[PDB]
Scaffold this active site. Sequence first.
Site, PDB file in Angstrom:
ATOM      1  N   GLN A   1       0.835  -1.212   0.000  1.00 53.56           N
ATOM      2  CA  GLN A   1       0.000   0.000   0.000  1.00 53.56           C
ATOM      3  C   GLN A   1       0.869   1.261   0.000  1.00 53.56           C
ATOM      4  O   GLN A   1       0.547   2.247  -0.669  1.00 53.56           O
ATOM      5  CB  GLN A   1      -1.002  -0.001   1.171  1.00 53.56           C
ATOM      6  CG  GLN A   1      -2.049  -1.134   1.013  1.00 53.56           C
ATOM      7  CD  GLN A   1      -3.260  -1.056   1.944  1.00 53.56           C
ATOM      8  OE1 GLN A   1      -4.354  -1.444   1.546  1.00 53.56           O
ATOM      9  NE2 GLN A   1      -3.068  -0.604   3.181  1.00 53.56           N
TER      10      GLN A   1
ATOM     11  N   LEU B   1      23.013   4.424  -3.910  1.00 53.36           N
ATOM     12  CA  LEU B   1      22.709   3.760  -2.642  1.00 53.36           C
ATOM     13  C   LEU B   1      23.916   3.707  -1.711  1.00 53.36           C
ATOM     14  O   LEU B   1      23.785   3.876  -0.490  1.00 53.36           O
ATOM     15  CB  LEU B   1      22.175   2.343  -2.890  1.00 53.36           C
ATOM     16  CG  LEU B   1      20.890   2.308  -3.706  1.00 53.36           C
ATOM     17  CD1 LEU B   1      20.328   0.860  -3.792  1.00 53.36           C
ATOM     18  CD2 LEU B   1      19.882   3.250  -3.086  1.00 53.36           C
TER      19      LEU B   1
ATOM     20  N   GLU C   1      26.129   5.844  -1.304  1.00 53.38           N
ATOM     21  CA  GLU C   1      26.376   7.119  -0.643  1.00 53.38           C
ATOM     22  C   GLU C   1      25.487   7.300   0.594  1.00 53.38           C
ATOM     23  O   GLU C   1      25.878   7.984   1.541  1.00 53.38           O
ATOM     24  CB  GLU C   1      26.217   8.289  -1.624  1.00 53.38           C
ATOM     25  CG  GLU C   1      26.627   9.612  -1.017  1.00 53.38           C
ATOM     26  CD  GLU C   1      26.649  10.756  -2.013  1.00 53.38           C
ATOM     27  OE1 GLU C   1      26.630  10.489  -3.235  1.00 53.38           O
ATOM     28  OE2 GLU C   1      26.672  11.922  -1.554  1.00 53.38           O
TER      29      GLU C   1
HETATM   30  N1  GTP Z   1       1.510   2.902   7.575  1.00 55.45           N
HETATM   31  C1  GTP Z   1       0.856   1.792   7.195  1.00 55.45           C
HETATM   32  N2  GTP Z   1       0.885   0.745   8.031  1.00 55.45           N
HETATM   33  C2  GTP Z   1       0.259  -0.392   7.716  1.00 55.45           C
HETATM   34  C3  GTP Z   1      -0.455  -0.487   6.457  1.00 55.45           C
HETATM   35  N3  GTP Z   1      -0.979  -1.709   6.402  1.00 55.45           N
HETATM   36  C4  GTP Z   1      -0.629  -2.345   7.530  1.00 55.45           C
HETATM   37  N4  GTP Z   1       0.100  -1.549   8.308  1.00 55.45           N
HETATM   38  C5  GTP Z   1       0.691  -1.901   9.597  1.00 55.45           C
HETATM   39  O1  GTP Z   1       1.423  -3.094   9.398  1.00 55.45           O
HETATM   40  C6  GTP Z   1       1.221  -3.975  10.483  1.00 55.45           C
HETATM   41  C7  GTP Z   1       0.500  -5.216   9.982  1.00 55.45           C
HETATM   42  O2  GTP Z   1       1.251  -5.826   8.950  1.00 55.45           O
HETATM   43  P1  GTP Z   1       0.669  -6.036   7.493  1.00 55.45           P
HETATM   44  O3  GTP Z   1       1.608  -5.447   6.516  1.00 55.45           O
HETATM   45  O4  GTP Z   1      -0.751  -5.656   7.480  1.00 55.45           O
HETATM   46  O5  GTP Z   1       0.821  -7.625   7.412  1.00 55.45           O
HETATM   47  P2  GTP Z   1       1.307  -8.479   6.164  1.00 55.45           P
HETATM   48  O6  GTP Z   1       2.694  -8.086   5.837  1.00 55.45           O
HETATM   49  O7  GTP Z   1       0.322  -8.440   5.075  1.00 55.45           O
HETATM   50  O8  GTP Z   1       1.403  -9.967   6.756  1.00 55.45           O
HETATM   51  P3  GTP Z   1       0.234 -11.062   6.938  1.00 55.45           P
HETATM   52  O9  GTP Z   1      -1.042 -10.372   6.691  1.00 55.45           O
HETATM   53  O10 GTP Z   1       0.462 -11.411   8.322  1.00 55.45           O
HETATM   54  O11 GTP Z   1       0.559 -12.133   5.973  1.00 55.45           O
HETATM   55  C8  GTP Z   1       0.419  -3.207  11.514  1.00 55.45           C
HETATM   56  O12 GTP Z   1       1.337  -2.609  12.427  1.00 55.45           O
HETATM   57  C9  GTP Z   1      -0.315  -2.178  10.690  1.00 55.45           C
HETATM   58  O13 GTP Z   1      -0.679  -0.981  11.357  1.00 55.45           O
HETATM   59  C10 GTP Z   1      -0.441   0.700   5.594  1.00 55.45           C
HETATM   60  O14 GTP Z   1      -1.024   0.690   4.514  1.00 55.45           O
HETATM   61  N5  GTP Z   1       0.218   1.771   6.022  1.00 55.45           N
END
Ligand code: GTP
Lengths: 447, 54, 420, 357
Positions: free
Chosen positions: A15, A252, A254
């Site tokens: 994302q 990178l 640097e």
């Molecule tokens: N800043 C931000 N944090 C995110 C986002 N999506 C998830 N998180 C954070 O990431 C953590 C959860 O991990 P995710 O990345 O959702 O998990 P994943 O890597 O998909 O792993 P699994 O779902 O366990 O297979 C939490 O601390 C969330 O708040 C996002 O779009 N932006």
Amino acid sequence: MRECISIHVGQAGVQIGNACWELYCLEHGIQPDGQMPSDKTIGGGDDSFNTFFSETGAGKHVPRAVFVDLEPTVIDEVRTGTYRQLFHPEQLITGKEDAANNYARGHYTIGKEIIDLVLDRIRKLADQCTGLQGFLVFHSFGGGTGSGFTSLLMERLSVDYGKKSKLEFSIYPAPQVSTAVVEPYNSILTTHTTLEHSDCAFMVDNEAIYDICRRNLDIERPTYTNLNRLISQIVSSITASLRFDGALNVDLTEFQTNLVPYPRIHFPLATYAPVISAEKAYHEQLSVAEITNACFEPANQMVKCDPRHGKYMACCLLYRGDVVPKDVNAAIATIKTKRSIQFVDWCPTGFKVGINYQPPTVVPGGDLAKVQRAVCMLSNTTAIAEAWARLDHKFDLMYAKRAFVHWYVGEGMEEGEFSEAREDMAALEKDYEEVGVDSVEGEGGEE
Amino acid sequence: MEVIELNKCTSGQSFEVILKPPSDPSLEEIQKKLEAAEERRKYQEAELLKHLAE
Amino acid sequence: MREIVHIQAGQCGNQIGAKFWEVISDEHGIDPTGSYHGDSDLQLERINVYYNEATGNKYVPRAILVDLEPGTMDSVRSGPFGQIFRPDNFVFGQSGAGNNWAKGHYTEGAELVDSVLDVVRKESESCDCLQGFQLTHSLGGGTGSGMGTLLISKIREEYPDRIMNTFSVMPSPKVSDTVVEPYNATLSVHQLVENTDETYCIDNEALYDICFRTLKLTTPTYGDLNHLVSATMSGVTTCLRFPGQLNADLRKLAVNMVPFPRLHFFMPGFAPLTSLTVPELTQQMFDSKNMMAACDPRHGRYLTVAAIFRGRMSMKEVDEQMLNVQNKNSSYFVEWIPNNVKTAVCDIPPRGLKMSATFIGNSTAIQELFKRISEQFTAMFRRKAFLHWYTGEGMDEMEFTEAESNMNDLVSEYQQYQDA
Amino acid sequence: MYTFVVRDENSSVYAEVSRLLLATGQWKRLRKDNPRFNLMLGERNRLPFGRLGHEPGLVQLVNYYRGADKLCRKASLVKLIKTSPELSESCTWFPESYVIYPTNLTDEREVFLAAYNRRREGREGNVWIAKSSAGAKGEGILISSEASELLDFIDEQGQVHVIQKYLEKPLLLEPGHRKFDIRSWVLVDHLYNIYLYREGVLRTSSEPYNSANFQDKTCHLTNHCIQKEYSKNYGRYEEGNEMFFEEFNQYLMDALNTTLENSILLQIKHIIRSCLMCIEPAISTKHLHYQSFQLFGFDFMVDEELKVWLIEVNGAPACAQKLYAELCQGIVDVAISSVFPLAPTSIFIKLHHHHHH
Ligand SMILES: Nc1nc2c(ncn2[C@@H]2O[C@H](COP(=O)(O)OP(=O)(O)OP(=O)(O)O)[C@@H](O)[C@H]2O)c(=O)[nH]1
Ligand SMILES: Nc1ncnc2c1ncn2[C@@H]1O[C@H](COP(=O)(O)OP(=O)(O)CP(=O)(O)O)[C@@H](O)[C@H]1O
Ligand SMILES: Nc1nc2c(ncn2[C@@H]2O[C@H](COP(=O)(O)OP(=O)(O)O)[C@@H](O)[C@H]2O)c(=O)[nH]1
Ligand SMILES: [Ca+2]
Ligand SMILES: [Ca+2]
Ligand SMILES: [Ca+2]
Ligand SMILES: [Cl-]
Ligand SMILES: [Mg+2]
Ligand SMILES: [Mg+2]
Ligand SMILES: [Mg+2]
Ligand SMILES: [Mg+2]
């Protein structure tokens, strides 16, 4: 020109990636269909923007990027969203069932089965590069995929691309938006296994971004959309030197040279100003001095901590917009006489400064107002270790009772891996303390 | 307060200001760790199936 | 992590399951003919978790109806949404289980169980990526209790890497059909300790008391009890059934809720229950009178909690109120699991309500429920009373001794973390 | 209902603050390691400031300023004064001081010896006092007119020391011809308001001051424990060798035809404000994610010209027995209830001055 491959792992990684590539396209004048009218060399070239984009014969500008997730719903949104034409299917990799917020499931159980496909897809990108520099890897600490799969990938990348640099953009967990109680475990496990494979990592604490959105963007309950647009601005600030003409942080290598004199202590603190609400009717534009001074306020840092109570090893100021060196130096002079800025004895007290004249690009219909000038400060300060202390303390509370450990052992991880990871973190906290703190005279209370 | 290495281009400029001077595992090994964990899942599953057989 | 296969077994299990399907069908805009007539895209986004699609945009519950006699399922088939179920998924015998765990687990049930597994296998086979199973049953009778736990064991053997979740109705002398309920429930609880990941503990005494003391129903029927259960099951599955970040699948829920493998017995709660603001919702959802295990939360500590809010409301206020509960009663949340309360919000409220909240607590207080059953078991077992009904099916007393020991061990493990 | 934790069981001041908070009926004491608190009454050493202010929904406040130790250690204070332009090497109200590291370990030895020899050749008084932060109560101190004994003394130790000019012309109370030092309690709140408790205390010697013998450290050191132990006249003039401001003011009027306010407190307030404003940017919690307050004990010497000299700053003071109730209620009123309002004629003097130049 030397290419950089971006790798986006898990929901957070993907994302945030989506937000960054949207912003990059807007900064470079690339349309959602990949066409870039300002680019007069059709079908190839070696401009600075080519570090992040290749070109097809038809003139499509394609991100040098792979997206990986162990379930498909997040990447599916990339496949169908606004910038879908930018990417081809070989860059988007999805499994069927995710790591269930379990580092061990991501690293051992599912990771074993998708890792080779991911490497084949990265190799396809590498084979397009004339002079690959290395990788920028985006992931959460807290997710099972972001934690467990990333550490596996990083290890294999050191094997398959030994001479190449690897930078991270890592999302540190915050209960205000977190989705799992075990996130401290996952964070410590992935940090332990990744430490030796990463040359420089930029940690962003969701707590800090969340609160910046609340306080400065007047958003009552920030969403990932709000968070990621802000994170994308900071990432773009950090990578701008790779994508535009310049002489600071131009490769990178640097980044490590300038920010990381001591290899384990490779976590620079980012601070960003100004963040201004687009809904703000009347706004007085902030000066070079005002935005530079803001770089020393904890309220604008990507991790809340107190640099007055640590030491600096390096400091880089990265400006975008209407800024000239004379005003930067006048600002710094003033700030020196007012702030607590102590460097370690074995580094010089100074700042490396880059200025790019193009002001920040804002996404239309975003939360951020257009500003005449902005700055991102990258400082390697021992104060960031406060974040390791917080995490290590939470780990210790749960692990002392072995809470949730069975979930990890059940995926074939040995319990010993927990204590090994945690010892590595203890030594890290100690390294920060040794580098950053002068002994305090002891006393023989009730005085 | 010395300014050094001033570099200028159409897109911007960079420089340094100094206030004061100073005073891996191989593929074989990764494979083995992943296979060892798989062996452990396999063992724990075999044990479960034995218990269910009883 | 997409499809869930639902199984409902015995009289209680089928009666509550039928109601569950009526309630979530309504929520997803599915009519009794399996046709969709909703107006929101949220309704269909994750519909495949509980429903298969058929020709002509028909949706069919991924549901298997099991019993050892025909009566209750005949009634289900005649019910409101009865025609929505797959006809081939009604699997039933004729002889009944006589409120006897041994008949359900070893004799009558043993004769039927392979045909149930055949249907389970057929449903599982058409899943792109099966998450696991949810079973509805009572522990006090013969079929849901004895055959339900036999099914769970065989399902685990065949699908050992899938999640097993149950909604398990616990018997109470105040709302009781026979005296052997404590024997059936003790035998079952040991099966659940070993072979489920998540069990929602629904005490018939709590349901009764809510109906009588709170809802002011002078003479609650099983139907009145089942209305509460219906509403609760809808609430606790909201996160599986609609777009969301938290506890969005059975495994992620287990990882958030279960810190030690055997302690996976949850107290559910619902608000409102009245004869509404965010603060009121929040206070009522944590109110013991709103919980359904007849255990006092103040007699224990919360290991983990999931809260789910439904309706259009301020997420800002939700977050504020949930923080206020934890910060003002922090002693009731174990300090060695940081941030152990997770909150979700879904815009779609249940029928007849503008907003609601559902509570899922993993509390050490649940030991009181197992203690009550253990006491009732021993009162009879010390005199070997009513045991001929079980020995006549081939069981011996030693199996009762072992089940009782197993449940006393469970009680001891809760108490250990209560003093941790 | 507000919540707090207690992490220093040895603190008499905060044991009383704790008692008071509870009696309001609006504060609850949590187990010390429960993180969901409003107020931390912190430990003296390695207080985990890094774990503060990361709790959604909780305003968090702690009773120490991170970084305040710079003012509250012997050698750190000397360095702070010498290296801060607005205090400075020529600071008039701090005795000439040098930081000395035992040879077995920068060090100002030669600078000290230089100044010492200058005074010797000039016939000037040349008595100095060696001390450190490790000086457990009455021990770890040497007063001498010989540089060699001072330096030798320090070399036998293992921690940094300060050598400081010893004030050879102290104001002496009569009768008794005796030395004293003044303790002032100062509370700095989360807004960095600086509050001087209206009550101070003179900790007196009960032995006649004798410049001809710096070996017997009973008329020379006004430490309560020293007096209480070695002084055979302990308590002869005032209970516990504590004289309070009412009596001291009356003495100043009768004997010197002046007041406490004019002759002494004007200087005390100037020194306190100067010290605390100097470190404000280093320790202020103004824009921080958690907030601090802290109680300090400043100790002063007064010379026979009624010049006030700062001797040290104590970061974790106790209070005089009869002043606990009032000071501790004051702390609750101004440091805590200010941040966490409950459902006079202040006991403090707010120190503020804004001269235009
Ligand atoms: N800043 C931000 N944090 C995110 C986002 N999506 C998830 N998180 C954070 O990431 C953590 C959860 O991990 P995710 O990345 O959702 O998990 P994943 O890597 O998909 O792993 P699994 O779902 O366990 O297979 C939490 O601390 C969330 O708040 C996002 O779009 N932006
Ligand atoms: N430069 C000086 N001139 C005269 N007397 C001095 C002095 N330095 C210290 N003293 C004497 O020694 C005492 C202070 O010694 P020091 O301050 O090291 O002890 P201490 O740190 O235990 C006091 P506290 O209990 O406030 O912490 C004073 O009370 C004073 O009587
Ligand atoms: N809540 C509820 N409990 C029921 C219902 N029917 C039976 N029970 C309870 O279920 C237990 C008896 O088991 P039952 O399901 O009828 O037996 P089975 O058909 O052999 O599984 C007792 O504890 C009853 O109180 C029902 O419709 N609702
Ligand atoms: Ca080109
Ligand atoms: Ca490397
Ligand atoms: Ca038969
Ligand atoms: Cl290489
Ligand atoms: Mg995911
Ligand atoms: Mg029945
Ligand atoms: Mg003193
Ligand atoms: Mg002292």
